[PDB]
Amino acid sequence: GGCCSHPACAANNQDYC
């Protein structure tokens, strides 16, 4: 989760997702 609420993070780092 974490920054995965922000497309910026979720689109570039799916490892947190």
Swiss-Prot record:
Cysteine amide, modified sites: C17
Cystine residue pairs: C3-C9, C4-C17
GO molecular function: acetylcholine receptor inhibitor activity; ion channel regulator activity; toxin activity
Main localization (coarse): secreted
Region feature (Ser-Xaa-Pro motif, crucial for potent interaction with nAChR): 5-7
GO cellular component terms listed in the entry, alphabetical order: extracellular region; host cell postsynaptic membrane
Tissues of expression: Expressed by the venom duct.
Taxonomic superkingdom: Eukaryota
UniProt KW keywords: Acetylcholine receptor inhibiting toxin, Amidation, Disulfide bond, Ion channel impairing toxin, Neurotoxin, Postsynaptic neurotoxin, Secreted, Sulfation, Toxin
UniProt keyword annotation of Disulfide bond present: yes
Keyword Secreted: yes
PTMs per UniProt: C-terminal amidation, in synergy with sulfation, is important for activity and structure stability. Non-amidated conotoxins has a 1.9-fold lower inhibitory potency on alpha-3-beta-2/CHRNA3-CHRNB2 nAChRs (IC(50)=0.54 nM), and a 4.8-fold lower inhibitory potency on alpha-7/CHRNA7 nAChRs (IC(50)=367 nM), when compared to sulfated conotoxin. Sulfation at Tyr-16, in synergy with amidation, is important for activity and structure stability. Non-sulfated conotoxin has a 2.3-fold lower inhibitory potency on alpha-3-beta-2/CHRNA3-CHRNB2 nAChRs (IC(50)=0.64 nM), and a 11-fold lower inhibitory potency on alpha-7/CHRNA7 nAChRs (IC(50)=836 nM), when compared to sulfated conotoxin.
Subcellular location: Secreted
Modified residues (Sulfotyrosine): Y16
Residue ranges of the TM segments: none
Domain free text: The cysteine framework is I (CC-C-C). Alpha4/7 pattern.
Protein family: Belongs to the conotoxin A superfamily.
Protein known as: Alpha-conotoxin AnIB
Organism, as annotated: Conus anemone
